[PDB]
């Protein structure tokens, strides 16, 4: 009886929290179209079908969104995969030349400042002795004046020469399924009203997570994963100021974004084998890129997010949405990609309201840049080559990223302003359900049995 | 038969169940413990780590009383200072995740105890078969 003995058990379920390098999986539909059409078509494995969502009883797991793993790992993965998808494309060091620019053939009005310049310059041929006088169109956000006469140069020539993305590759997101390696498990919190920190009373283990589209949007995160019943706000500490408030709502608001010119690309041969895709002529009228959001649906979703946000600040508070406060152009404005073209769409038409305690559309304008500086590194660009035809993309805004104002002085109202900041706040809105655990076998328990000789 | 499904003993499938109930299904945790450009490299950097740590814990069973028996009657008396709680409330109430936190402080003397007990009974068995 009291002669109880140690018995080991190998292969018994207990886990600890851990960090490890995770592992891709892509769907077979992305394998149906081949030949590096988009990135990570060879760097990741084909998935298995019917992933085993296995429920567990009587389990209270402590999840944490903000000190989570799998997001700095995902961020390093996506920036390294960005870097590897530019090495075979060309380098544009022979283009930092003194450009002679002028205005485009257009009725120039003095109030409207033209976003296009017509720039002509010398460039080497594939024959090294000869040079050709070519012309192209650039955006005013890419050239800068050198000081009568007018001479321009590119914006990045005194910082870094940089790479045109070779346009056989594309930039639309394909879903990536992260998978745990052997000897690790992935837990998913199947609770509904789960704000993102603390115990989750209904967990389930998954071998490989669902489709995560990596989108790069700063505010107004697009193509995301919706909620279940409510609109959910979440924060690390809501009484803090420096931490963004992630908002994810249930029914999406669709957004139609376009640029209505048709660029005609032309190939300017730099040297042997290296070509440079410039903008030729604009046939038809020149117009401004824009985006449309349904007004009634936007007002309804802002009503829902005010009804949700009053639960954390008292019901008798006046919530006021203002536009962005300032900073660089990739955070003051809604930045995204659309069919391989980078839009920067103004956002003051949406975030402008005041809510008290009791078929039209919003058109918001955009400006597009050809030279990006994504992830803000020291010696990088990407010269996005132009796309032929008009460009239209329809997507579905699912979430928002907000920021309070750090109010003193007897303030009865709370002003909310959008703000992009980091890019990890995007994927942090998609990996909130998931924790990675190291399963460890080999438990030790006493029982009533003794080893013989 | 139609209109009916089939469930099969899933991975981690009894993590909230009782220790007496989880003590019958250990083999699925053992089966899904081994099997399942630099990116291949880094998942290679994952993969061998898996197999490395797998062999590591089996090496521990190589030193104690049982190489592959997957449960193991031993000959170390259970000190009541570790648990001081009777069997019928351990095997019929608690789950394993609670027990691991409960005796996670009391480890690393059990491992040396088991090692010494196995080596001691091994050399005694060698001396027993020696005199024949």
């Amino acid at each position, epitope marked *: 009886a009291e002669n109880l003995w140690v018995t080991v058990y190998y292969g018994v379920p207990v886990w600890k929290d851990a960090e490890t390098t995770l592992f891709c999986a892509s769907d077979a539909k992305a394998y149906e179209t081949e030949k590096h059409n988009v990135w990570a078509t060879h760097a990741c494995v084909p998935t298995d079908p*019917n992933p*085993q*969502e*296995i*429920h*567990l*009883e009587n389990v209270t797991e402590e999840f944490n969104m903000w000190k989570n793993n799998m997001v700095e790992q995902m961020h390093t993965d996506i920036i390294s995969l960005w870097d590897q998808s530019l090495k075979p494309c060309v380098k544009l060091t022979p283009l930092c030349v003194t450009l002679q620019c002028t205005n485009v053939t257009n009725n120039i009005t003095d109030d409207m400042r033209g976003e296009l310049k017509n720039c002509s310059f010398n460039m080497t041929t594939e024959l090294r002795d000869k040079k050709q006088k070519v012309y192209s169109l650039f955006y005013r956000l890419d050239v800068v004046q050198i000081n009568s006469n007018k001479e321009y140069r590119l914006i990045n020539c005194n910082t870094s020469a940089c790479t045109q993305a070779c346009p056989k590759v594309s930039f639309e997101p394909i879903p990536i399924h992260y998978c745990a390696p052997a000897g690790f498990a992935i837990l998913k919190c*199947k609770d509904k009203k789960f704000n993102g920190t603390g115990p989750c009373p*209904s967990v*389930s283990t998954v071998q490989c997570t*669902h489709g995560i589209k990596p989108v790069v949007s700063t505010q107004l995160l697009l193509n995301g994963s919706l909620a*279940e019943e409510e609109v959910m706000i979440r924060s690390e500490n809501i009484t803090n100021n420096a931490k963004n408030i992630l908002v994810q709502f249930n029914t999406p608001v669709q957004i139609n974004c376009t640029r209505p010119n048709n660029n005609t690309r032309k190939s300017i041969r730099i040297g042997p084998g290296q070509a440079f895709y410039a903008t030729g002529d604009i046939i038809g009228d020149i117009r401004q890129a824009h985006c449309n959001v349904s007004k009634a649906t936007w007002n309804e979703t802002l009503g829902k997010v005010v009804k949700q946000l009053r639960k954390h600040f008292g019901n008798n508070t006046i919530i006021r949405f203002a536009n962005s406060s300032g900073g660089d152009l990739e955070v003051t404005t809604h930045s995204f990609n659309c069919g391989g073209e980078f839009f920067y769409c103004n956002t003051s038409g949406l975030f402008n309201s005041t809510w008290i305690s009791n078929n039209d559309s919003i058109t918001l304008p955009c400006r597009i840049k050809q030279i990006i500086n994504m992830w803000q590194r020291i010696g990088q660009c990407m010269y996005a080559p132009p796309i032929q035809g008009v460009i239209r993309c329809v997507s579905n805004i699912t979430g928002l990223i907000l920021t309070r104002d750090g109010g003193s002085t007897n303030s009865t109202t709370e002003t909310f302003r959008p703000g992009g900041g980091d890019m990890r706040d995007n994927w942090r809105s998609e990996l909130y359900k998931y924790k990675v655990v190291k399963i460890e076998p080999l438990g030790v328990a006493p029982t009533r049995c003794k080893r013989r000789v | *038969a*139609v*209109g*009916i*499904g*089939a*469930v*099969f*003993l*899933g*991975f981690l*499938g*009894a993590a909230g169940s009782t220790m007496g109930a989880a003590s*019958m*299904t250990l083999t699925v945790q053992a089966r899904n413990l081994l099997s399942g450009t630099v990116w291949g490299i880094k998942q290679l950097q994952a993969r061998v780590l898996a197999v490395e740590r797998y062999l590591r814990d089996q090496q521990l069973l190589g030193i104690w009383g049982c190489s592959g028996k997957l449960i193991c009657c031993t000959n170390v008396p259970w000190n009541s200072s570790w648990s001081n709680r009777n069997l019928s409330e351990i095997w019929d109430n608690m789950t394993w995740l609670q027990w691991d936190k409960e005796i996670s402080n009391y480890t690393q003397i059990i491992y040396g105890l088991l090692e010494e007990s196995q080596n001691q009974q091994e050399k005694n068995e060698q001396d027993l078969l020696a005199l024949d």
Partner: antibody
Amino acid sequence: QVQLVESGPGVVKPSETLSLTCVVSGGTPGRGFLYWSWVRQPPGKGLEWIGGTATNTDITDYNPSLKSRAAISKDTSRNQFLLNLKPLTAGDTAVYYCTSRAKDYRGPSYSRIDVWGPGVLVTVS
Amino acid sequence: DIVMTQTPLSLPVTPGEPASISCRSSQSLLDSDGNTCLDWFLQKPGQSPQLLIYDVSNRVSGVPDRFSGSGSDTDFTLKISRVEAEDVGVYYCMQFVEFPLTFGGGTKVEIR
């Protein structure tokens, strides 16, 4: 299989559409699949199985007596599955059940998992 | 479809006497695997059905041995050795050898 939740309109006039949703809390506790069904019971009459589907496939089985008026679908990401019925007659007044069934091999002996939701009575008038 | 007939449709029973309920199918219930696919449920008034008897003679756990099931390929009998107050309700046989699943018409044990 820990929980099944039925939903749909509680009173419907004969020209509208009967739509029912069953939300599964705790899909499956092991490898394999479950079979999820809708079953109905008219007052003082027997149980009648309307239809169902396996979690492992996208093919649904329907009772031929129902004249191909029923359409059943699913989506596991929302852990839901649905039954739609159009046209209606007073004979479709019934208590409606969602059910989940599987053979259970997790114990020392072969047993069954067999769970039913509480059901919702629907009277058409 | 296989037509399932349960007899009788309405049988009120006084507490304590034994009962036997018959069920018949238009086809054999022996399937490929050798299993006879017939379950018995009881639906007490204002409650959900609860599985009572499954393959040939086996009772679900927690159900007392007072309930017993027997049968051939097409003819089945549920016997209750001693009737108690919570046995009242509608008893159902059900086939699952083939789609559609079909239930017997039910036997209502009620207090007159």
